């Protein structure tokens, strides 16, 4: 996995098994934050 350019904006693609692991559907709002040098993303 790597950071790619979508538009003129950095973006990371999320594999299907990760969407299912978090019960995330397209457009689900998520909270992004930086914790312990890691990018954290949790569903709202």
């Amino acid at each position, epitope marked *: 996995s790597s950071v790619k350019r979508w538009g003129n904006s950095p973006a990371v693609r999320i*594999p299907a098994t990760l969407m*299912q692991a978090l019960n995330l559907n397209i457009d689900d709002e998520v909270k992004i934050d930086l914790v312990d040098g890691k990018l954290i993303i949790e569903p709202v």
Partner: nanobody
Amino acid sequence: QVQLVESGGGSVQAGGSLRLSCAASGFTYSRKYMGWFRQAPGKEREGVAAIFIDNGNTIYADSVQGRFTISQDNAKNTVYLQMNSLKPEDTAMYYCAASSRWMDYSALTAKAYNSWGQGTQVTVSS
């Protein structure tokens, strides 16, 4: 990535329950999710349940949702498939599977797994 051993198979009367188990060994800490697949006589293998190791979240195929439930004991590196209200159509060879990677396929599909058990037979008498 891990070796898988299923157990618990057997013959049960229709309407009954049965609990299957799957013990993983090897690089058990690499497991992202594990699932149960089954092959009924003459048919293609289908995914029935999956469980994500880190958060215990589960997903099920329409054919068994509500009747089958998958759980885990991470201490023992094992996953279980509880089957309630079994019916003759549930007769099949049940296989345990595991993935050490976050594949871009549904966890209810075979392409999402890279480790497979030998299967345990479940027969439900009409």
